[PDB]
């Protein structure tokens, strides 16, 4: 008697389960991945940080690159928090770039729509570009946050 289970099969695939942002490599080196964070954890977390992703050539890093000598193990890191926004934290040996503009390392920056981060600057032939995608679904939850219905 699985009445509720039967309906669950109706959807099958649920997009935007708890996705924060998605990283898409436009330079063709790293496979598209999706960064995610749980809402309960966000509302529960209060240590000036909920969930942060680390990117680089390190297998530990939340993001694995194609192994670039210029890029560092953990070239860059992305943090999620605030009232309802995302932040980008650069953590490379040579620096992290935003649309051609180099930002201050280990510095928090406001997220941008379809933004892109460039890394491995120094040699025109040794730079890597990454694009960041934002899940509108996630914003909806944060925008509504507390739902007025149940007492």
């Amino acid at each position: 008697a699985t009445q509720r289970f039967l309906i669950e099969k109706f959807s099958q695939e649920q997009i935007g389960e708890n996705i924060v942002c998605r990283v898409i490599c436009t330079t063709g080196q790293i496979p598209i991945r999706d960064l995610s964070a749980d809402i309960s954890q966000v509302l529960k977390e209060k240590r000036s940080i909920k969930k942060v992703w680390t990117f680089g050539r390190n297998p530990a890093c939340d993001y694995h690159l194609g192994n670039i000598s210029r890029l560092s193990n953990k070239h860059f890191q992305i943090l999620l928090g605030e009232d309802g926004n995302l932040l980008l934290n650069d953590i490379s040996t040579n620096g992290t770039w935003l649309n051609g503009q180099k930002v201050e390392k280990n510095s928090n920056q406001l997220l941008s729509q379809g933004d892109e981060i460039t890394v491995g600057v120094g040699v025109e032939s040794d730079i890597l570009s990454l694009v960041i995608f934002i899940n509108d679904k996630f914003k909806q939850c944060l925008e509504q946050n507390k739902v007025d219905r149940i007492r």
């Binding site: 050539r57 000598s69 210029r70 890029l71 560092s72 193990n73 040996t93 040579n94 620096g95 600057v121 120094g122």
Partner: peptide, 13 residues
């Protein structure tokens, strides 16, 4: 630290 991964640094400060 300096050993692995190429790095840069300007000599003007």
């Amino acid at each position: 630290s300096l050993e692995v991964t190429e790095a840069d640094a300007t000599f003007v400060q």
